[PDB]
Symmetry: D2
Subunit: 461 residues, 4 copies
C-alpha cells in the first residue's frame, strides 16, 4: 500500500537488500551505533530531510537513523550517483525516497521538492542531513517557515561546509550545523582513502584503459587530491600535480610527485599563449579535485593530448568547462556516463576521428558516476559521524529555544574528538586491529586520560 | 684568533665547510631568508642560546642567524647527534660551539653550561633556540635571573613543546615561546618525511641488514611513526603498527598496515603473561616513535626474536627500557652506536652467542645517532621557521615590556599560516615545482586572497 | 542475410563497435601489423578456428586476422568471459561467432562445435588459435581427420602450453604449435601486469569491498601470482603468499611479502589437523593463481574467516574445490558471478546468516568473469604475437609437406626474439617512450647489432 | 708469524670479526653448506685464486671455502670496494689477502699478482673465483702454464660472463667455467634487490641528499637497472628510464616509469645538437647500469643540470666518460669517493661555484665504493652458488682429463636448477617463510616431482 516514493525499478529491491546485508557487515561503527542506541531511541520524533548520494552505503545510514527512531524523506545530491538497487530496497522498506541514476536537472530539483513536501504541503521536518548544500539552500531561499521548526543541519562534504560558513558570515544561516566533513574519521578517511579506492575504479569501469605507464595530471592536492593522486600512482601512472596552495604543493613534492601548472609560470592571463601546450600535449588523464571553478578550462581542453580522459571528482561539475565543450564540440556517447568529445566541430564527426577527448560522468563526480563511490568500510566512518551529529543536534532542540538562547548556539561546529576517536576505534576493530591501552604512568607522562582524548584539538594527524 | 669553543677535531673544519656550501644549495628557504633580510639586519643585538643537534643543517641555521645580525653560543641537544666536521666548521668561523659526537652525560651538561656562561659569568643572552627543552629547563631551574633579559624561546620538536605547555599551565613559564614544531612545513615535513629518509638510512649504516622480507614493529603512528613506517615499508619490510590513539591506528590500517599490540588485548598488566610472545617472537626490528615512556619495556625485550634490532627515534631514550638491559645483560660494542645485548647474562657472553639483541645509538634517537639525521632540503623548512620565529620574538622585545603587557604576551603560539605558506613556496621552488596562481574569480569563489592564506586555521592537510 | 552466429543480443553491436574503435587506438602493435601487412595479405586462404575469451580485445585481434586475409569461426574459451557487445559487433561484421556471457557447460561445448562444423559438416579449417587447449583437444580426440588439413596451432596461455607439451612428449600432437605464452611481450606483460590491472578491478566490481587494511592470501607466485599480489598490495592489502617453488617464494620474500602455507609445516596430509586454522581464520581474501588442482581445498574453505572472498584467476576453476561447496553448502546469488556460500549447511540459508563465503565467477577466471580482463594496451602485446605466430605457421604449410619434412617441423616453438623486441618497441612507442639507438661502438662493445636482438636466448628479463 | 698479506690496518681484525659473526647469522644458505659439507671436505686439495670485493660478505664466503677444505689467496676486484675491517679479519685468520679501500690502479694490479705468486713463483693454484674477469684475463695472457693445472673458473657477475663467452667463442678459453651470475638466486636476487638496497644507501652516505621529489635518470633497465630504479622510486624520486632493449623498455613503462633517451629521438648524431638538453637540464641524478661503454658521455655531462649527482653501478667505470672530466674540468674532493667536478675550467675553481657535478666513487660501482654493497642476506644467495660451483668444477678435475675428454667439457655453464632451488629454499627459510609441499596428485597434475625442479629450463621467473 506504500506509494510515497519514486525509483527507477522497484523490482531491484531484493538485489539491493542482499547488498545492504553485506554492507552492514562492512560497517561496524554504524552498526555499533544501531546496537548501542536502539533501546533508548535517541531519534524518536526526529523527521529528517536527507539529500545525499542514494548508494548502498546511504541505505545503511538511512536504516540506522530509522532504527534509532527517525522518520526520513530522502533524495540524492547528484543526478548520477544513485544506485537503483539501493533506492529500490529503501523504498521497499516503506521509506520515502526519490532518486534514480541518470536524472535530468529538472528531475533532480523535483526529487528534492518531493522530500520537502508531503501530500502537497510542507512536511513536519525538524532535521536536515545534507551533502553539498543544495537542499540547505533551497530551504533557506524558499521554505523559511520550515526552518523555524528544524533543529539542525549535518553537512557531509567540504563544499557544503563552505556554503554553510558563508551563510554564517552573512548572518543568513537559520539553524545550527555540524561540520561532519572535518571529523578526522571523515576528512582523513573518506575524502582521501575513499577516492584512492574509487577513482581508478571509476576510470576502469568507464574506459577499461590501462593506467600503468601513462601520464596523469591531478588538479589539486587537498584530501581528495591526495587520495586521487595515490589512486593513479599505485596503478603505475606518471602523476603530475597542480596546486595553488604551496603547503599542499610541498606535500606533493615530498610524496614523490612533480608539481606543475597548466599555465606558463602558473600565470593564467586568459590567452591561449599562457598555456603550457607542451605539458598538456603529453597528459593522458586529467582529474580535478579542487572544489573550485574552471580549473580545467577551455584552453587547457584545447591543448590536451588527443584521446585524453577528462574527469572530475570534486563535488560540482563546473571544475571542468563542460559548457565550452557542449557549445563547440560534438558529443558521442560511448555508453552511459562515457562520452567522446570530438574537437573537430559542433555538428557531426567522422566516426573514426582521432581528435577527441573522453569525458566521464559528464564532468560530475566520477567515482559515484562511473562506479559506486567509496566502499562501505570507509563510508562507515563518515556515516557513523552523521548519526552522532544527528543525535547531538536533535537533542539540543534548537528550534524550541528562545531567541536569546538560539543566538548562543547558532554555529557551524564539529563533533568532539572523543566521539571521533570512538568511531575510529570501531573501524580499527573492524580490521581486527588491537589498540594498546596506556598504563596510568604512561597516561600521566603524556598528560592524557587512559580513555582519551589522546591529542589536543590543534593536532593535524 | 678564536679559542672559545670545544669540538672533537678542529682540523675537520675544511671538510665541514665544503659540506656547508653544498647544504646551502639544498636549503633555498633558509638561504632565501638570508638574502631577503641581509641588509635589514633584523637580528642585530640578538644573543641567542642555541641547543640543537650540531649537524651540517644546524650549521646553515647558525650562519643564517649570524648573517642577520645575531651572536650565538651553541651546543647539541643529544650526545650522539653532533657531526664533528660541522661543529669544527662552525668553531672555525669564530662561533662558540661546544659539541662533539659521543659525549658522556657529564660532558653533555658541561656543554650546555659553556653556552650559558661566558668567561666565568652568565652571558647577556636575550634569545633561546631549543630542541627538546633541556636548555629551557636549565634556565628556569638554575638561571632564572637570565630569563629576565630573554625575549623568547623558539622550540623545535614535539617533546619540547609539551614541556613548554606544562610550564605555561603551571604558571612557571618565564618567557613566551613559539611552537616551531607545529608549522606544517615542520611537523608534516620534518617529523614525517625526515624520518622516512633517515630511519632506514641509520639502520643500514649501523647493521647493513637487508630489510626487505623481514618483520618490523613500529610503536606509534604519529608524524614520526607515519614516516618511520613508510621508511621500512618502502624497503619491503612487513610492518605492523602499535598505537594507543584509535584515530592514528585507523590511518595505519588504511595505509596498509596491520595494527597490533605487544600486550594481549592491548592490556599491559605488568606481568610477562600479558606479553604476546608469539607476536614478538617474529619481530626482526622494533622502532619506538612515541615520545612516551617505556613503550618497549623489559618484558617485551625478553620476548623479542633472537638477534632483533632495537632502536628509538623519539627524542628521549627512555622509550626503551635500556636501564633494564644495562642491569641484566652483557653489552658488546660492535662499533660506535651499535651494541649487541646478550640475554644470557651480565658478566660474560660467548663470542658466538646467538641469543642477543642489536641496540642502535644506545636507545638515543637513531637517525642522528647512527646516520646524519634529516637531509638538508627537509631541515630547510624547519629552520626557515626557526629563523622567522627568532625574528618575531626578538622584535617583540618581551623583556623590555611593562608587567601589564608582559602577562598579555606570555604564550606558546605558532607562526601565522601566511609565513608557513611562504616557507612552503620556497621549498616547492627548490624542487622546480610551479604553483598555480588563482585568478580573481577563483579566489573569490573559494573566499581567499590570491596571495593566501589559502586554508582556514582548522585545516589539517 | 548473415545468420551464422549465436550471440546474446545483436542490438549491442553499435556499442561494441564504439569500444572497438577506442581499443584500436589502445593497441598500436596490433594495428601496426594490420597496416604493415594489409597489402601483402599474408593470411589469404587461412581459415582459423579461434577459441578465446570473446572480449573487445579479441575483437581487434579477429578483425586484424580478417584484414590480413583470413576467414575465422570463433568461440569463447570460458563461459563467463564474453563481452556481449564485442560478440555482437563481430557478428554484425559477418563473422561466425558463437559466444555470450553466462553460458552453461553444455552451451560451451555446443559453441565450439559450431565453429568446427559449418552447415553440419566439418569446416575446411587450416589454422587453430586457442586459449587453454579445449578446442585443441576436441580436434585431436574427436575430429582427427580435420587436423590433416591444419597447418598449426597458436596457443595463448600457460595451461594450454602444458597440454601441448604433454601431447608432444606422448607423440599425440598432430600439428605444430607456437607457444605464444612465452614471448616476453606476453608472459611478462599479459600474465603479470594484466592481472595487476584486472584482479582488484574484478573484486571491486563484484563486491565493492574496501581492500586496504585487509588480509589477503595469494596461492602461487608465478607470472599471474606476481601480478595478482601487486594488484592487492598496491591497494593497501596485507598480502601473504603461498608457493611450492622455493625460487618463486624467494622472489615473494624480496618483494616484501610474508610467505606462508595453508598447511602446518607446508605438509598437507589430507586431514583438518594439518590446516593452519589460525592463519586462514584471519584471511579476508584468497586468490588462486597456480594452474594446479585443488590449491584451495575443502578443509581450507572450512577454516577461512567468516565472509572471506574466494576467487580464482588461474585458467580453470578446479583450483578451488567448488564441487565440495556445491555439495555441502547453500548458495545465495547476490548478482551474476557473485555468490554467498553459507557454511551453515545444505538445507536452507538464513538471509542474515553471518557464516558465509563470497565466491566470484563460480571459481572461473575472476578478472574476465567479474570485470573485462586485461586492458587493450596490455592485450596488444599478446595479440600482436598471436598474429605473427599465425602468419609464421600458415606460411610453413605443414599439412602440404612430405611426411619426412613434417616430422622435422612437428614442434612446440616460441617466436624469435627479434619479433618479440619489435612487438615491445611498438608498445613502448604507444606510451611515448623513446628508446636509445646504440652507436656502432657500443653495439660492438656488447656484441649485438644496433637493430637487435639485444639479449641471448637464455636471458630472463 | 703470518705475514703473507697486505691490508690497510690489521688492528681492525676484531671489528671485522664481530661483523663476520653477525653476517653468518644473515647468510643461512652459506652456513647451511658449511654445516652440510664440513665432514665431507669437498674442497680438500682445492687452491683457489679469488678476486672479488673484499667485503664482510666475501669474508663469510672465504671462510666457508676454507671450512670445506680449500686454501685461498685473495684480492679485491675493485679499488674502492674493500671493507678494511673485513680484509684485516681475514688476514688475522692466517689467510693470504691483498686488498684495501682506496687502491691505486698500480696497487690493484700488484694485489692480483700477489695472489698469483707465492714466494716469488707461481702458486700451485687449481681453481679460480672471479668477479669481472680481470684475474681470468691475467691468467690467460700472462700465466698460461698455471691454467694447465686449474680445474675451472666460477664467475660472479654479468660483465665477467660476457668476457668468458667471448673467450669461448674465440677458442681462447683454457679452462671451463660456471656462470654463477645466471642462477636465479643470483641475477634475480643479487643484481636486482641488492642494488635496490644499496644504491640509495650509497647516495645518502656520500651526499646526504634528499631524494624524494627530485628527478632521476637511470640508464639501463636490466637486472641492475630494475633494482636501481626501484631504489630511487621507493624513496620518492621521479625516475625516468633509458634503454636500448625495447623489451626492457616495455617493462619500465609497465612498472610506472617514463622511458626517455638522452639524445633527441634516441639518435646520437655525433654533436651536442642531438643532446636533449631540456631533458638533461632537469635531471638531479643520473645512474648508469648498463655494463656498456660511454652511456653517460661528455656531451650529456655538459648538458646536465647544475649540481646534479653522477654515479655508476655497473662493473666498470667507463660507463661514464670520467676521462673527459679529468682532462677538462677541475676536481674538488668533498670527502673520500665524493668529488665536485667544476665545469668552469680545468685550471681551478671558486669555492662557491654553482656550476659543478657531484661524482661518486670516481665512476666506480657506487654501492660498494660509497657504502658496503649488497647486504649479507642477499649475498647469501650469490655466494652459496659460488661454493656449489667451486665444488662442482673442482670435483670434475678438468686439468687431469686427457685432451679428448677436456674437449667434451670445455664450456661456460650454469648450475642445475635443482641447486638453484635448494639455495632459494634456505633463503626462504631465513625469512621464516614456509614453502608448501605438493601432494602426489598435484605433482602429477603439473608434471613435476614433489622434490622439484618445479620449472622448465626455459622459465624466466
Ligand atoms: N567524490 C568524492 O567522493 C568526494 C569526497 C570528498 C570530497 N569531495 C569534494 O571534492 C572537493 C575537494 O574536497 P577536499 O576535501 O579535498 O578539499 P580541500 O580544500 O582539502 O582540497 C582542495 C584543494 O584544491 C586546491 N585548489 C584550489 N583551486 C585550485 C586550482 N585552481 N588549481 C589547483 N589546485 C587548486 C586547494 O589549494 C586545496 O588544497 C570538494 O568539492 C569536496 O566536496 C568529493
Ligand atoms: N628523531 C627525529 O628526527 C625526530 C623528528 C621529529 C620528532 N621527533 C620526536 O619523536 C617523538 C614523536 O613525535 P611526533 O611528532 O611523532 O609526535 P606525535 O604525538 O604526533 O606521535 C606520537 C604517537 O605515539 C603514540 N603513542 C603514545 N604512547 C604510545 C604507546 N604506549 N604505544 C603506542 N603508541 C603510543 C601516540 O598515540 C601518538 O600518536 C617526539 O619525542 C619528538 O620530539 C624526532
Ligand atoms: N586470468 C588471466 O588473465 C590469466 C593470464 C595468464 C595466465 N593465466 C592462467 O593462470 C595460471 C598461472 O599462469 P602463470 O603464467 O602464472 O604460470 P606459472 O607457472 O608462471 O605460475 C604458477 C605458479 O603456481 C605455483 N604453484 C603450483 N602449485 C601450487 C600450490 N599447490 N601452492 C602454491 N603455489 C603453487 C607454481 O610454483 C608456479 O610458480 C595458468 O592456468 C594460466 O593459464 C590466467
Ligand atoms: N654493483 C653491483 O652490485 C652489481 C651487481 C650486479 C651486476 N653489476 C654490473 O652491472 C652491469 C649490468 O648488469 P645486469 O645484470 O643488470 O646486466 P643486464 O644485461 O641484465 O642489463 C644491462 C642493460 O643495459 C642496457 N643498455 C645497454 N646499453 C645501453 C645504453 N647505451 N643505453 C641504455 N641502456 C643500455 C641493455 O639493454 C641491458 O638491458 C654489469 O656490468 C654487471 O657486472 C653490478
Ligand atoms: N657486499 C658485496 N660483497 C661482495 N660482492 C658484492 C657485494 N655487493 C655486490 N657484490 C657483487 O659485485 C658484483 C659487481 O661487481 C655483482 O655481481 C655482485 O654479486
Ligand atoms: Cl660509433
Ligand atoms: Co553532495
Ligand atoms: Co633535541
Ligand atoms: Co582459455
Ligand atoms: Co668484480
Ligand atoms: K560503494
Ligand atoms: K643530514
Ligand atoms: K578489457
Ligand atoms: K654489505
Amino acid at each position: 500500500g506504500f506509494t510515497d516514493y519514486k525509483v527507477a525499478d522497484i523490482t531491484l529491491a531484493a538485489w539491493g537488500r542482499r547488498e545492504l546485508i553485506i554492507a552492514e557487515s562492512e560497517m561496524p561503527a554504524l552498526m555499533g551505533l544501531r546496537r548501542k542506541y536502539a533501546g533508548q531511541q535517541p531519534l524518536k520524533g526526529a523527521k529528517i530531510l536527507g539529500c545525499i548520494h542514494m548508494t548502498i552505503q546511504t541505505g545503511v545510514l538511512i536504516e540506522t537513523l530509522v532504527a534509532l527512531g527517525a522518520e526520513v524523506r530522502w533524495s540524492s545530491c547528484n543526478i548520477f550517483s544513485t544506485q537503483d538497487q539501493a533506492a529500490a530496497a529503501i523504498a521497499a522498506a516503506g521509506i520515502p525516497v526519490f532518486a534514480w541514476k541518470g536524472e535530468t536537472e529538472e528531475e533532480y530539483e523535483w526529487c528534492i521538492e518531493q522530500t520537502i513536501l508531503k501530500d502537497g504541503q510542507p512536511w513536519d521536518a525538524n532535521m536536515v542531513l545534507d551533502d553539498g548544500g543544495d537542499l540547505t539552500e533551497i530551504l533557506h531561499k524558499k521554505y523559511p517557515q520550515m526552518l523555524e521548526r528544524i533543529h539542525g543541519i549535518t553537512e557531509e562534504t567540504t563544499t557544503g561546509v563552505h556554503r554553510l560558513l558563508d551563510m554564517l558570515k552573512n548572518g543568513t544561516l537559520k539553524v545550527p550545523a555540524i561540520n561532519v566533513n572535518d571529523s578526522v574519521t571523515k576528512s582523513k578517511n573518506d575524502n582521501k582513502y575513499g577516492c584512492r579506492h574509487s577513482l581508478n575504479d571509476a576510470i576502469k569501469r568507464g574506459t577499461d584503459h590501462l593506467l600503468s605507464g601513462k601520464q596523469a595530471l591531478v588538479i589539486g592536492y587537498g584530501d581528495v587530491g591526495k587520495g586521487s593522486s595515490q589512486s593513479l600512482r599505485q596503478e603505475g601512472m606518471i602523476v603530475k600535480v597542480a596546486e595553488v596552495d604551496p603547503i599542499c604543493a610541498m606535500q606533493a613534492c615530498m610524496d614523490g610527485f612533480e608539481v606543475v601548472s597548466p599555465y606558463k609560470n602558473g600565470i593564467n592571463d586568459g590567452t591561449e599563449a599562457s598555456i603550457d601546450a607542451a605539458l598538456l600535449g603529453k597528459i593522458d588523464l586529467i582529474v580535478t579535485t579542487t572544489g573550485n571553478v574552471n580549473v580545467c578550462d577551455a584552453n587547457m581542453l584545447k591543448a590536451l593530448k588527443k584521446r585524453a580522459v577528462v574527469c572530475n571528482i570534486g563535488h560540482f561539475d563546473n571544475e571542468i568547462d563542460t559548457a565550452f565543450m557542449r557549445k563547440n564540440w560534438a558529443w558521442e556517447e560511448v555508453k552511459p556516463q562515457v562520452h567522446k568529445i570530438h574537437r573537430t566541430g559542433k555538428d557531426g564527426f567522422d566516426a573514426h576521428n582521432d581528435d577527441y577527448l573522453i569525458l566521464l560522468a559528464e564532468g560530475r563526480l566520477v567515482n559515484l558516476g562511473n562506479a559506486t563511490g567509496h566502499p562501505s568500510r570507509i563510508m562507515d566512518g563518515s556515516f557513523a559521524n552523521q548519526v552522532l551529529a544527528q543525535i547531538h543536534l536533535f537533542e539540543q532542540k534548537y528550534a524550541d529555544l528562545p531567541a536569546a538562547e538560539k543566538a548562543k548556539r547558532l554555529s557551524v561546529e564539529v563533533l568532539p574528538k572523543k566521539l571521533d576517536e570512538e568511531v575510529a576505534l570501531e573501524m580499527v576493530k573492524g580490521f581486527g586491529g588491537v589498540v594498546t591501552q596506556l598504563t596510568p604512568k604512561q597516561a600521566e607522562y603524556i598528560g592524557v586520560s587512559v580513555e582519551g582524548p589522546f591529542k589536543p584539538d590543534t593536532y593535524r594527524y
